[PDB]
Design brief:
This is part of a larger assembly, with two copies of chain A and three copies of chain B.
Chain A (H helix, E strand, L loop, with lengths): L1 H31 L18
Chain B lengths: L25 E3 L8 E4 L1 H9 L1
Antiparallel strand pairs in B: 1-2
Classes of the chains: A mainly alpha, B alpha+beta.
Subunit structure (chain E): Part of the ESX-5 / type VII secretion system (T7SS), which is composed of cytosolic and membrane components. The ESX-5 membrane complex is composed of EccB5, EccC5, EccD5 and EccE5.
Subcellular location (chain E): Cell inner membrane
Protein name (chain E): ESX-5 secretion system protein EccD5
Chain lengths: 50, 51, 157, 415, 100
């Protein structure tokens, strides 16, 4: 049971490492491809025709 | 009583498949904001109500 | 990018008036009409060729997008020649000549879920022959379209 | 009817009056409206409104609820003279998050939705526990005086008052925050009860009229003294002073000379009946007394402080009168003495007065406490006439009466 | 003239008004445009929206502004105000429940 308990703990730390990497892709992709309804207010920003 | 279900054991009759086809996402709806949205698999969403 | 529409239901495309991308130095009722004005310019050369990021520096700058809403059989000349490079067509009718290729077809379910063949994130190349779940559709009204276009219509080079 | 004038709120708090088209859909107007407010801010020399990342511009009621983009201004419950708010609402779209093992999943999700115990709350629990302990102590100490005339009750309770008050004073001086003040107030309020019964128990002999005069007097004084120096918990202290004051008047009369309790009970009821009309004036003049300051939220500060103080005094005053009337009214009616039906109908009309008067005040709690004061009297009278003069018809009738009474009102209002 | 003509083709009633006044262009807030200056002098560009309105002699406009924190005004609208029917229903339910 001790090995089992330790094994479970090692798996948790990999979960955390994966999650931070995922947020970076969401932020980056969202930074280039916003939802269509928000595009009107952004017209004046330099992000247009970029 | 809350139905928390512990995972079922394979009974030692098949090997592990490291990458089967991923599980299908589920959609949600709202009446006024009629535009639907998606948020995740059924097996995972239930736990948030179960707890 | 430059855009052209070939459609019979002109009342649906009325909002296009404000956009600059549809201008020229432009909506058509049929392939015969489009063939006289536009095809004389574009049919002159080439055929489609899948590109890549590094190759993007060499292809000509004005990419042309054409929307198909007429179902005219006259299109066979460009379809049997396998298109042209620097052009892209969207078929809104679902005609058999366009509909005979799974690698180019998007299917809608009653729930708005779209199905298509799976494609690789790094090369965009098709990796399997069986269709599967692809994406949940996002859509805007004509009013929203004209509202956005008017806001865009305010700017120039 | 083609247009309506409304006041629009913009960035950081500038209000601007505008005349809007009454029939075009709101989504067509939000864009040019933003342009106009920017023009006025620029001329004013203020910073114009700007977008931040991902979001959209919206027009909402002052409550924040956004208006339906496709509807006309006349289709909605918007009238000329109303006010609206232009606001920027950020995008909420984001990636989801999944966890595969149920045990870890349960722990992670459950710890965000709720707040766990901490040392701050821990003290309030202990303070409340000691308060309950001492009110039980005075309870047992008070009961002994009802069978024995020895000095024990006053001697023992006196030391308790000192000990509790002693701790309360230090806490009051060292206090820094609202949480600390809560602890201090709980402790101080708990000292009033032991000090009060410690005094009332001192006069020897069987308990009665002479002992009553001491108790309600010191009690009234203690509450008034605490209110004077603390300036917090106005409503509850006000209520204690009223019941202590009125009881002291009757006690002194009963102690010196009184032909009957009915005479005293009738007098108090009459005083209370007129006091309801005096209550708003009392609250209004009481608000002028100078005592320290602690808000529940530069010249504006004084007005709001005065307003909430006055409101606070009225609720407590109303409550004290309500307590007195039910005690007196239920004692005055009787199922055996003379014209048994006369006080019943008189109590009904007396209840109707408060039931109707509730409409004169806009405040939710004030109107509810008034309404509640009437309902309880009706039920109480039926119970009295159900326990005494007991029989199958009486209980059957009282049940029917009590169940129908509220049912008719609720049904007429909800359906 | 062309607007009234177009309205008739749509089957809509033409713009018309009664009383002393005049016809002019106005902004979304009702403010009229300058009669003697160019649209190029004014801040007008392709895709802007304008209104046609009758300026009666009786017209009066506030033209005044004031400052108060929006964050407080919005909170105070609910922090304390008059009673609501929904609450009365809930209290009513509680009263009848108390009765039984």
């Amino acid at each position: 049971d001790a090995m089992r308990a330790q094994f479970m703990l090692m798996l948790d730390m990999l979960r955390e490492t994966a999650q931070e990497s995922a947020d970076s892709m969401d932020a980056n992709y969202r930074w280039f491809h916003p939802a269509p309804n928000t595009l009107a207010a952004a017209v004046g920003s330099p992000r247009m025709w970029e | 009583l809350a139905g928390i279900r512990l995972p079922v054991f394979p009974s030692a009759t098949s090997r592990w498949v490291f990458e089967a086809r991923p599980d299908l996402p589920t959609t949600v709806v709202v009446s006024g904001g009629s535009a639907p949205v998606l948020e995740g698999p059924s097996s995972v969403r239930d736990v948030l109500l179960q707890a | 990018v430059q855009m052209i529409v070939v459609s019979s239901d002109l009342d649906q495309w009325d909002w296009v008036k404000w956009l600059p991308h549809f201008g020229d130095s432009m909506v058509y009722t049929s392939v015969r009409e489009f063939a006289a004005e536009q095809a004389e310019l574009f049919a002159g050369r080439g055929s489609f060729t899948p590109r890549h990021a590094s190759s993007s520096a060499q292809t000509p700058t004005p990419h042309t997008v054409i929307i198909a809403d007429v179902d005219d059989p006259q299109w066979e000349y460009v379809i049997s020649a396998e298109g042209v490079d620097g052009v892209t067509f969207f078929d809104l009718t679902g005609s058999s000549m366009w509909t005979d290729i799974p690698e180019r077809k998007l299917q809608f379910d009653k729930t708005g879920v779209i199905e298509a063949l799976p494609r690789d994130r790094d090369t965009w190349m098709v990796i399997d022959d069986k269709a599967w779940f692809f994406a949940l559709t996002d859509q805007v009204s004509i009013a929203e379209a004209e509202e956005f276009a008017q806001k865009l219509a305010q700017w120039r080079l | 009817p083609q247009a309506v004038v409304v006041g629009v709120m913009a960035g950081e708090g500038v209000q601007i009056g505008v005349l809007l088209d009454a029939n075009a859909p709101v989504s067509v107007m939000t864009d040019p409206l933003l342009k106009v407010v920017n023009s006025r801010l620029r001329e004013l020399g203020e910073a114009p409104l700007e977008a931040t990342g991902r979001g959209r511009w919206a027009l909402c009621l002052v409550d924040g609820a956004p208006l339906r983009a496709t509807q006309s201004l006349t289709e909605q419950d918007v009238y000329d003279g109303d006010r609206l708010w232009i606001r920027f609402i950020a995008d909420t779209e984001r990636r989801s998050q999944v966890i595969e093992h149920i045990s870890t999943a349960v722990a992670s999700d459950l710890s965000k939705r709720f707040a766990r115990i901490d040392p701050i709350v821990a003290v309030q629990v202990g303070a409340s526990m000691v308060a309950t302990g001492v009110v039980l102590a005075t309870g047992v100490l008070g009961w002994w005086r009802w069978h024995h005339n020895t000095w024990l009750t006053t001697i023992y309770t006196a030391v308790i008052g000192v000990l509790v008050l002693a701790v309360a004073m230090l806490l009051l001086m060292r206090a820094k925050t609202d949480a600390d003040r809560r602890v201090a107030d709980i402790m101080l309020m708990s000292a009033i009860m032991p000090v009060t019964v410690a005094a009332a128990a001192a006069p020897p002999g069987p308990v009665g009229s002479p002992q009553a005069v001491l108790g309600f007097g010191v009690l009234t004084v203690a509450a008034a003294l605490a209110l004077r120096f603390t300036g917090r918990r106005l409503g509850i202290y006000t209520t204690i002073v009223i019941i202590g004051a009125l009881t002291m008047l009757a006690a002194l009369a009963r102690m010196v000379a009184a032909t009957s309790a009915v005479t005293l009970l009738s007098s108090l009821l009459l005083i209370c009946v007129v006091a309801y009309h005096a209550a708003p004036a009392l609250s209004r003049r009481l608000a002028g007394i100078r005592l320290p300051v602690f808000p529940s939220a530069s010249s504006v500060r004084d007005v709001l402080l005065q307003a909430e103080r006055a409101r606070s005094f009225l609720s407590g005053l109303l409550t004290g009168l309500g307590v007195m009337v039910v005690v007196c009214m239920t004692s005055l009616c009787d199922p055996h003495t003379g014209q048994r039906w006369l006080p019943l109908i008189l109590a009904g009309f007396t209840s109707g007065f408060l039931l109707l008067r509730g409409r004169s005040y806009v405040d939710r709690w004030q109107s509810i406490t008034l309404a509640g004061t009437a309902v309880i009297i009706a039920a109480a009278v039926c119970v009295r006439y159900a326990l005494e003069l007991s029989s199958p018809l009486a209980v059957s009738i009282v049940a029917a009466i009590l169940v129908l009474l509220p049912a008719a009102g609720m049904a007429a209002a909800a359906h």
